[PDB]
Subunit: 109 residues, 4 copies
Amino acid sequence: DNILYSGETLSPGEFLNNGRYVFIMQEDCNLVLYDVDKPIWATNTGGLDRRCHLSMQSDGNLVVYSPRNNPIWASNTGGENGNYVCVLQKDRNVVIYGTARWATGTNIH
Amino acid sequence: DNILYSGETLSPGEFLNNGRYVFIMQEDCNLVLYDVDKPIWATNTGGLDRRCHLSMQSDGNLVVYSPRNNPIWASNTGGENGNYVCVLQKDRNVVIYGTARWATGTNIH
Amino acid sequence: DNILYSGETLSPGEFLNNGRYVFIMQEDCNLVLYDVDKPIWATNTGGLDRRCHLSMQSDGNLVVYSPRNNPIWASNTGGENGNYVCVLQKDRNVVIYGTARWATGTNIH
Amino acid sequence: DNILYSGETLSPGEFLNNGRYVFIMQEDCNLVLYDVDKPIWATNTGGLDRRCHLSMQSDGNLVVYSPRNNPIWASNTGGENGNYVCVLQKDRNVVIYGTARWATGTNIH
Ligand SMILES: OC[C@H]1O[C@H](O[C@@H]2[C@H](O)[C@@H](O)O[C@H](CO)[C@H]2O)[C@@H](O)[C@@H](O)[C@@H]1O
Ligand SMILES: OC[C@H]1O[C@H](O[C@@H]2[C@H](O)[C@@H](O)O[C@H](CO)[C@H]2O)[C@@H](O)[C@@H](O)[C@@H]1O
Ligand SMILES: OC[C@H]1O[C@H](O[C@@H]2[C@H](O)[C@@H](O)O[C@H](CO)[C@H]2O)[C@@H](O)[C@@H](O)[C@@H]1O
Ligand SMILES: OC[C@H]1O[C@H](O[C@@H]2[C@H](O)[C@@H](O)O[C@H](CO)[C@H]2O)[C@@H](O)[C@@H](O)[C@@H]1O
Ligand SMILES: OC[C@H]1O[C@H](O[C@@H]2[C@H](O)[C@@H](O)O[C@H](CO)[C@H]2O)[C@@H](O)[C@@H](O)[C@@H]1O
Ligand SMILES: OC[C@H]1O[C@H](O[C@@H]2[C@H](O)[C@@H](O)O[C@H](CO)[C@H]2O)[C@@H](O)[C@@H](O)[C@@H]1O
Ligand SMILES: OC[C@H]1O[C@H](O[C@@H]2[C@H](O)[C@@H](O)O[C@H](CO)[C@H]2O)[C@@H](O)[C@@H](O)[C@@H]1O
Ligand SMILES: OC[C@H]1O[C@H](O[C@@H]2[C@H](O)[C@@H](O)O[C@H](CO)[C@H]2O)[C@@H](O)[C@@H](O)[C@@H]1O
Ligand SMILES: OC[C@H]1O[C@H](O[C@@H]2[C@H](O)[C@@H](O)O[C@H](CO)[C@H]2O)[C@@H](O)[C@@H](O)[C@@H]1O
Ligand SMILES: OC[C@H]1O[C@H](O[C@@H]2[C@H](O)[C@@H](O)O[C@H](CO)[C@H]2O)[C@@H](O)[C@@H](O)[C@@H]1O
Ligand SMILES: OC[C@H]1O[C@H](O[C@@H]2[C@H](O)[C@@H](O)O[C@H](CO)[C@H]2O)[C@@H](O)[C@@H](O)[C@@H]1O
Ligand SMILES: OC[C@H]1O[C@H](O[C@@H]2[C@H](O)[C@@H](O)O[C@H](CO)[C@H]2O)[C@@H](O)[C@@H](O)[C@@H]1O
């Protein structure tokens, strides 16, 4: 998957992928972007705690939470309630977009 | 591909796909969403002209243009200049999100 | 997924996909290959029964079984026991390959 | 792409991908399988020369050729002429299958 939708989370070891790029919520609590074997971006929160999770929230904020549910990193983009997306793009950028401006209304459960 | 980025276009016969779903700019100028062999949404512009193209614009508007570059359908979401995305989602909805709220800044050319 | 590995099955409504192509084991027991909304190949077993499953076997034979576990269509490629793959290719062909000639041996659970 | 078909090649820097796995023909002539940032298998031909290419041949042999078109590594699976596939699987194994046993015959240009 290349998208983390608002209301979804990445558990320890889970990730987004796109070609040779991997965006992973590591077990050591560091959120890192890799280009094959080379790290190119990170939250620099490795070794702070064990088994953290990443959450794309409905308020638009992207946050890393500790095992005790305390934030340890955030994009600082919390605002109006709505629908957002965190995308690992084909050009190697990781971007948050929102809110939803238009839709076909063809969603299913 | 499941995303049409702002500044990109779908030429006649091109499309977005996601599992069993296909969102295609048909040669008959009708933009249609299919669930395998069943059409579930369309712009209802079939037979109006031949070889139209779809454009996700930098102003946030999604537009179908005729071979003479005249609009024949639009999402009516034009506004502030920026970065947007049109996504064919895993839940079968087609949604426009934007503008960009945050990014890692790791893009390459 | 674009591959059905030997030892796996497609349940009623399940499928393989690749771009604008879908290879689906339909609820009406007909196994069909679609190019967007157009059927291009089928087992022609629609109407015989409901809820059939497709199985890529370890003997190399691809078989459609009825709800009573009786075969109603097969590729007739049964042979030596081994590892095989049924692939929905990027060129629109559906092909069975095997057995395995070589491997890195890096498989994990 | 998760498959390298017979008759195709991977140029320097090109690769196969599947989720968090990448199988790349590196510019340093070393063919390596990575699990995110960790190498798990390699031809061990790094440093021998620069700009080598990987070829999945119609005789079933997977070969790494130097810039002077001399083989420097091979799977030793050459045999009858036909159709084969080198697949980077979802279970992390890299495997060669062939020849083709059956097909729908729906291939197009
Ligand atoms: O330290 C073991 C750890 O190494 C790799 O992750 C790295 C660490 O999170 C950290 O020092 O920051 C690096 C990015 O700046 C990051 O690569 C991984 O191999 C990980 O799996 C391993 O646990
Ligand atoms: O404010 C509502 C919001 O609170 C919690 O998330 C927090 C906010 O997104 C923000 O101000 O930044 C915090 C991290 O710096 C973040 O925890 C959550 O409880 C969320 O569900 C709620 O909507
Ligand atoms: O409107 C775009 C939006 O549609 C779907 O979410 C829906 C909306 O959030 C809302 O009006 O209530 C619906 C029921 O709770 C909900 O499904 C999704 O497809 C979402 O991804 C999309 O952004
Ligand atoms: O009319 C030929 C045309 O049929 C199918 O497209 C359909 C048309 O665009 C129209 O009548 O509206 C339908 C959705 O409401 C749509 O499916 C396709 O098979 C197309 O390829 C073909 O040219
Ligand atoms: O307004 C600037 C914009 O103009 C043209 O696009 C138009 C607008 O997006 C909008 O008001 O709706 C029209 C269709 O109803 C659409 O054509 C383009 O020239 C675009 O590039 C430009 O930014
Ligand atoms: O900022 C998010 C944005 O980054 C990349 O686009 C860049 C910006 O639009 C801008 O500041 O100028 C850059 C050079 O013109 C441009 O690349 C893309 O990754 C884009 O998709 C993303 O939304
Ligand atoms: O309406 C029944 C059935 O129609 C479509 O499947 C078709 C049938 O299986 C049959 O007549 O053979 C066709 C291929 O030659 C095939 O398309 C689908 O729309 C299916 O979902 C539906 O149940
Ligand atoms: O022969 C062992 C094999 O038997 C059953 O599969 C059958 C064979 O693959 C073949 O001769 O063709 C039959 C359909 O025409 C097919 O059922 C299964 O029981 C299988 O598990 C077993 O390996
Ligand atoms: O050898 C290629 C083969 O490896 C894996 O399957 C394994 C073999 O079939 C065998 O030696 O026994 C193992 C345990 O039963 C089995 O995992 C898979 O990666 C398979 O896809 C591949 O063809
Ligand atoms: O720095 C050179 C080279 O390092 C990495 O590739 C490694 C080498 O090919 C070699 O020492 O063998 C390793 C596998 O056993 C392999 O990882 C990559 O970072 C590569 O891009 C780089 O050129
Ligand atoms: O034998 C015909 C074959 O020759 C060359 O490939 C070689 C063979 O696949 C094999 O015996 O092993 C060699 C590496 O050890 C390999 O080069 C090619 O010229 C090929 O095109 C041809 O089919
Ligand atoms: O038969 C399976 C095979 O079909 C297609 O390749 C074709 C055959 O190799 C052959 O009969 O000649 C054709 C023209 O040279 C060739 O296209 C492909 O779909 C291939 O991937 C597949 O294995």
